[PDB]
Amino acid sequence: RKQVSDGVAHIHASFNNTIVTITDRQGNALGWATAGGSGFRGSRKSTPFAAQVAAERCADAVKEYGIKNLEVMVKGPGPGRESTIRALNAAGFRITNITDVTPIPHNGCRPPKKRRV
Amino acid sequence: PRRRVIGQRKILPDPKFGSELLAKFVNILMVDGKKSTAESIVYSALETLAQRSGKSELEAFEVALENVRPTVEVKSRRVGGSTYQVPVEVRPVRRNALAMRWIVEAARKRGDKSMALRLANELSDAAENKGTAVKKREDVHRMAEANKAFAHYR
Amino acid sequence: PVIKVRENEPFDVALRRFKRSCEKAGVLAEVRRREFYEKPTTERKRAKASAVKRHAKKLARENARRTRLY
RNA sequence: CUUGAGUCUCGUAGAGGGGGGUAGAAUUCCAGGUGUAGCGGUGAAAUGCGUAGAGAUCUGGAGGAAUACCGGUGGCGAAGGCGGCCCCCUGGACGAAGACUGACGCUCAGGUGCGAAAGCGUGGGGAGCAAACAGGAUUAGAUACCCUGGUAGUCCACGCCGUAAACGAUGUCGACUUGGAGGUUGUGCCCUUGAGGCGUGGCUUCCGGAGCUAACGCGUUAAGUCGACCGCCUGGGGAGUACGGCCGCAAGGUUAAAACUCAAAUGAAUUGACGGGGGCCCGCACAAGCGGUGGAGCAUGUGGUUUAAUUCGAUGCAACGCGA
Ligand SMILES: [Mg+2]
Ligand SMILES: [Mg+2]
Ligand SMILES: [Mg+2]
Ligand SMILES: [Mg+2]
Ligand SMILES: [Mg+2]
Ligand SMILES: [Mg+2]
Ligand SMILES: [Mg+2]
Ligand SMILES: [Mg+2]
Ligand SMILES: [Mg+2]
Ligand SMILES: [Mg+2]
Ligand SMILES: [Mg+2]
Ligand SMILES: [Mg+2]
Ligand SMILES: [Mg+2]
Ligand SMILES: [Mg+2]
Ligand SMILES: [Mg+2]
Ligand SMILES: [Mg+2]
Ligand SMILES: [Mg+2]
Ligand SMILES: [Mg+2]
Ligand SMILES: [Mg+2]
Ligand SMILES: [Mg+2]
Ligand SMILES: [Mg+2]
Ligand SMILES: [Mg+2]
Ligand SMILES: [Mg+2]
Secondary structure (H helix, E strand, O other), rough: OOOEEEEEEEEEEEEOOOOEEEEEEEOOEEEEEEEOOOOOOOOOOOOOOHHHHHHHHHHHOOOOOOOOOEEEEOOOOOOOOOOHHHHHHHHHEEEEEEEEEOOOOOOOOOOOOOOOO | OOOOOOOOOOOOOOOOOOOOOHHHHHHHHOOOOOOHHHHHHHHHHHHHHHHHHHOOOHHHHHHHHHHHHOOEEEEEEEEEEEEEEEEEEEHHHHHHHHHHHHHHHHHHHOOOHHHHHHHHHHHHHHOOOOOHHHHHHHHHHHHHHHHHHHHHHH | OOOOOOOOOOOHHHHHHHHHHHHOHHHHHHHHHHOOOOOOHHHHHHHHHHHHHHHHHHHHHHHHHOOOOO
């Protein structure tokens, strides 16, 4: 029911999946969408196209809120990391700032062991 | 082939209507090198179709082709050890050829008695967009849509 | 890799700057390397291999590739 | 006596060691807000988590471990090893000029100390990871690889253990023998005219001459030419095993045989072949297409069975309408 005009698009782009989440500038989430829910599984949801349609879906979902400006915070190494932002722009927000917030540790916790494939 | 960009071969246009496309259709239809028979069948089908549907033989034929050509087909790209069905835009010469092939196969299947009759019925159906060749095209498109995620990552 | 789209900057252009900034930062490379635990011995060995290969290649190009190829 | 060896003076660089604080990023968990059906994972799945509201996102809190960038064939250390920042204690190396002692040196069986990781004892701690273990896949099976979990352990204190491909697979000390390109850290002169010119020490990387080597290669940091001392080897297996001794809480470590058995076992390089190596390329090899065979009847050849005989031969492609 409310209007905000200016949101943040948090694009969590892991290798398996892309989660797009539109939020108010404060942190409160408005709508979200994933390639999984967008209708892609496995090899198909780990692709740029899936991310794009997820982004489109998210934009549609938050259409009620009437969001006009949008800053995008990209996280993780992902097949989308670009498709989502392109899709969002096409869906027709003014992209104001694009920021990378991928969490790199300063040599912290030990990663899991290497896969033998 | 590996090392060949061979020149496309010369097809003569059919005598009745002077059309290369029609000639190609006749060739596809033909069996056992029996061209005369194929041309007779094609002409009979065209004449019936023109009478039933309208304008000319060539215009009716074109309409059917338009409703049965595929924009996109799928190939199997096998790079990551597994095979990805990738969509791919089908070039115009192939579009005509594939459509013609589909139409002839559908006609062969069809239950009407004479070949000419089957062909005429199939063509008319294609024109309307409720036949089997058209169904085949639809299936091809459906597959392409399904595998659209693998379109521009070959 | 923070970017702010300037006044009258096209979107494609903005995207280009963002990608360049990320590449310069080296975020993707860092994440990929930190995906799994490389053993210290493995890290040392890889470093040694990289150093050897780089040196050998440079020497080969500059000094060995000063002859008539045809 | 002063050239080896050491002392003193002044500086230098350093993840050298011990102790105590602290910082930020990130993971985990906890509480709360927003919010809604997915998340997670894989080659593809499932187990797992989520409508009891997860994942995502913002705030706050707890706690443990490790210190991104700098970061380097860089540095330090006898080796093992050492990596945020700050302080306290502390060892060594190097250069400069002198001054001092006056062979005080080198090596070392026994002996003594130090000695990664795993492991052990006692007491803490426990985020992440993860032997064992559990479930899901894969598979002929899969007590594995992959996935989701996960306990010892990894961390701290103090003891033990005492071994590693603990490797430069190269014992320590000293002298001598053509070069080139670097890195690092001192120092003398040159106006530093600029980041710069010419020297002279230390450590260090690569290339290469003579010489050496079975060859590969080593080559002023030698595997070259020599001297001192030590350690060790004498065919493969049996076997670094048994017995005995010593050490250890244990796991085990260390010292260390014999019978019996074979005529080889090995090192380096060469030519092939092969690779679920790599690069380049071709062929109805695939792909794109068209028509068949495999089902039916019959012809024909073969296997088999049968027969008195069913003549003999061909029998993966490259025998089977073949000799015929
Ligand atoms: Mg994983
Ligand atoms: Mg220091
Ligand atoms: Mg030193
Ligand atoms: Mg001894
Ligand atoms: Mg330990
Ligand atoms: Mg313990
Ligand atoms: Mg304990
Ligand atoms: Mg785990
Ligand atoms: Mg596991
Ligand atoms: Mg040993
Ligand atoms: Mg070592
Ligand atoms: Mg040894
Ligand atoms: Mg000694
Ligand atoms: Mg050399
Ligand atoms: Mg013997
Ligand atoms: Mg023993
Ligand atoms: Mg014993
Ligand atoms: Mg084929
Ligand atoms: Mg048959
Ligand atoms: Mg049969
Ligand atoms: Mg046979
Ligand atoms: Mg015979
Ligand atoms: Mg025979």
